Amino acid sequence: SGAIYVGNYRVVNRHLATHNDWANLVWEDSSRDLLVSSTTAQGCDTIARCDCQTGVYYCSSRRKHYPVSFSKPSLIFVEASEYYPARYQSHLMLAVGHSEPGDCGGILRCQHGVVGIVSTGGNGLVGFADVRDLLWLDE
Numbered sequence: 566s567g568a569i570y571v572g573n574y575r576v577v578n579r580h581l582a583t584h585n586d587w588a589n590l591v592w593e594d595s596s597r598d599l600l601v602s603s604t605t606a607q608g609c610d611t612i613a614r615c616d617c618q619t620g621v622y623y624c625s626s627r628r629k630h631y632p633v634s635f636s637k638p639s640l641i642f643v644e645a646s647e648y649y650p651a652r653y654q655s656h657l658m659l660a661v662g663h664s665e666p667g668d669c670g671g672i673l674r675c676q677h678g679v680v681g682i683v684s685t686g687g688n689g690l691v692g693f694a695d696v697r698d699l700l701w702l703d704e
């Protein structure tokens with residue numbers, strides 16, 4: 566679990582969005598596993614606007630932060646789960662690191678701010694949904 570709180574927006578994994586997120590929907594994209602909802606309170610986070618390929622993410626299944634090198638946002642095949650059919654997930658960045666399904670929502674940050682959230686993982690892999698291209702989150 567986890568979310569990004571920026572301005573009057575809450576960014577979460579689309580597959581983990583609540584009834585309240587859907588009732589206050591701003592934007593969602595199944596191909597990216599992202600959903601953004603509106604909030605009444607001002608958010609605590611800053612979004613990175615950069616091309617960093619290293620950073621640190623929070624891994625809830627270890628209660629620890631890990632440094633990672635990750636690939637640029639791209640279209641990557643993701644196997645079928647309970648939440649989605651087998652498909653290509655866009656704007657996804659992969660890195661070698663520990664992840665379990667419940668780690669989704671953990672933030673990946675670089676020196677400039679929030680880069681994205683955990684969305685996929687495998688045998689020693691962790692995948693992050695990028696948010697750096699969503700310029701409207703800052704206005």
Ligand SMILES: Cn1ncc2c(NC(=O)N3CCC[C@H](C(N)=O)C3)cccc21
Binds near residue numbers: 643646649665668688
């Ligand atoms: C080891 N392992 N295995 C699945 C998984 C995971 N993702 C999942 O459980 N997924 C289910 C929810 C939708 C996700 C998607 N973006 O399509 C995939 C996150 C982190 C480590 C993971």
Ligand SMILES: [Zn+2]
Binds near residue numbers: 613614675676677
């Ligand atoms: Zn950066």
